[model samples]
Target chain A: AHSDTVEFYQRLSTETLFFIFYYLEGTKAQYLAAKALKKQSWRFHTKYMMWFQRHEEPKTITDEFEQGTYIYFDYEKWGQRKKEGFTFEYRYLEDR
Target chain B: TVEFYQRLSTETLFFIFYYLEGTKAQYLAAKALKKQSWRFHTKYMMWFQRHEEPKTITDEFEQGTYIYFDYEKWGQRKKEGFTFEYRYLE
Candidate 1:
């Protein structure tokens, strides 16, 4: 029973099905993103803490601007569960 | 084309936006937001507020217009403080 979460890059060339992770960027961009996102009810704090069953070498994904540490709890693939797994993604959004 | 349920654990409402006077505005707003990827939307949350009253007016163009007045509750501070204001078009 293994669950798997997918993480990825912000491609300029393609659209993604999973939630694309973006660096918080700057306070201005973050504020704008916050403002833009506020109109939607889906809000999750970055410190979305959860206890895990196992620990290992932490993965770090980064861009020039911000770093995001992402993990999906109870990620399911096909028909199984993957516990104690996380993914990291770093991105720089050209927020013009 | 969407439905949402909102839940809040506080004592205030926030900004709500609506356009005026006709059904055309709905289409117009949707087009504008969609083109900009803004998308048509509404944001709200229900918390532990302890007040209610009915309004004397109604919107016949729509099924029903419900209003509550004299609502008050303990407010949150700074990041917590909340307020609500609304406008009607047409």
Candidate 2:
């Protein structure tokens, strides 16, 4: 049986952090250029986990924050966004 | 308070469809990120508005079984004397 899972760190390196910042600098209008990253998405592993469907308990990836203001509060801080959108588009394609 | 819903033009929708067809990964990524940030939605909407109209004219040709573009004339090419002589002799 093949049992392997891909993982990513919430804390990024300075280089990668800067890269992401530069990749998404300025207002939302200018960031759309990064949409081209879709062309390169074939090079990475893209997995999907539906957030809306969860009857069972969730698996814990990290410990509870010692001082909690809510995990989402911290998530918002890290992502640098005040308000998120309600509607979403979902679709998948086979790697080219 | 009055609620407002945004309406997209048919031309904008067609362009969005074409963009989605060309870059599925990017489009999906943007959509996914929309949950975490309105940045993606704003970016896509702005981009769609900017290039709402077609700017170029193209011609397509089908020759027998092969398809040809105006810029990509299909079929074989004619070569020079030296290469032609060697190819014919060989």
Candidate 3:
């Protein structure tokens, strides 16, 4: 487990956190992943979350919530965006 | 986190580094913020308008061995092009 990422997550009040529970390219399952860390979806952005089923329910995630944010990202539906290359902001905001 | 959000997300920095694969350099960047291997030295990013065509950068594109980019920026600007950062390899 990456403690630093989770710790940093709790230390701040931020928005539009990203989480990727599955990768359908070669890996897919109903419950694709048992856990989705905050780091997994860091670049996905917030603007797209509202229209999709991006939900933040702390009560649902029984374990990781103590550290990371508890959110369900509908990658199963919107994962097609993953096929495209990252946009300008997500790419530029990467290294800076 | 106003500027911080636009600056660099934590996962973006460490995640991008770790995907470099588990080399000794990755360990330090992902583990401890000690001295590491590659560092951001320079960049080559161009935003072409709707009517313009994107160009191909040679050295900066080649030098951008440690990063990923795409053609096109989203939103009303309709900006399109690739951006490459020259990470100084250690």
Candidate 4:
């Protein structure tokens, strides 16, 4: 029975999802057209990477920019995770 | 009455709505990015450091090894004709 379940896009973890949403800056139409699309006839992992470079647009300081950056907020602490003593122990339920 | 997001320009609003449609957490994060550049850079640096390999962070870097951070390797800063001082922890 074909489940009609789109595994690739649907199962994306939040981190990957954020990557797609934040990093990949393209139109919604482009995303929708490619959504649920299986990758290049690969049986093992049939998922297409929607990889694109950031467009060369000049930066403008705007409310949107402020809000978008703010999203990372208190989440911005950089330290390596070690098995022993470390600054912090971060458990990612999802990849980041 | 229209909301503040509603006041944004077409493309601007589109961008906001795009995230708003994706995840509640990310949407909020997008809004916050606008307010603080430091937070954005911190997160951006974190993302850039691991752009090559995302599965695990420590596995990608050897213990106590400092890699010179360069955006040109990624082909980003050059397009804008901009360069910056880069150091792993500097």
lDDT by residue (B1-90, candidate 1, tens digit) is: 211102210111111112122454334433443343221212332211212332333443222222221112222212122233222221
Q: Give the least accurate 10-residue stretch of model 3 chain A, judged by summed lDDT.
A: A28-37
RMSD of 4: 21.6
Each prediction's total of clashing residue pairs, residues at least 3 apart in sequence or on different chains, is 9, 1, 2, 21
Better of 1 and 3 by DockQ: 3
- Docking outcome class, model 4: incorrect
Per-model TM-score on C-alpha atoms: 0.21, 0.14, 0.21, 0.17
Give candidate 3 misplaced runs (Cα > 4 Å). Answer: A1-5, A11-72, A79-96, B1-39, B42-90
* Ten contiguous residues with the weakest lDDT in model 1 chain B: B8-17
What RMSD does each model have against the real structure? 15.5, 20.3, 17.0, 21.6
Which candidate has the highest DockQ of all? 3
Comparing 3 with 4 on DockQ, the higher-scoring candidate is 3
Cα lDDT of model 2 by residue, B35-70, tens digit: 322221122222111112223323431111211111
Per-residue lDDT tens digits of candidate 2, residues A1-96?
A: 111111111222222222332433573422332232323221111232111211223333224211111111111122221223222123322233
Sorted on lDDT, highest at the top, how do the candidates line up? 3, 4, 1, 2
The residue ranges of model 1 lying beyond 4 angstroms of the native Cα positions read A1-31, A34-84, A91-96, B5-13, B17-48, B51-90
Residue A44 displacement (Å), model 4: 9.9
Candidate 3, residues B1-90: lDDT per residue as tens digits? 133223334443343243335554344443332222223323323211123232544664432123222212211122234343334322
Fnat per candidate: 0.00, 0.00, 0.00, 0.00
Q: How well does candidate 1 reproduce the true complex, by DockQ?
A: 0.02
Candidate 3 lDDT, A18-42, residue by residue in tens: 2212211233210222212233443
Q: Model 4: per-residue lDDT, tens digit, B48-84?
A: 2222222223522322212222322322221121222
> What is each candidate's DockQ, to 2 decimals?
0.02, 0.01, 0.05, 0.02
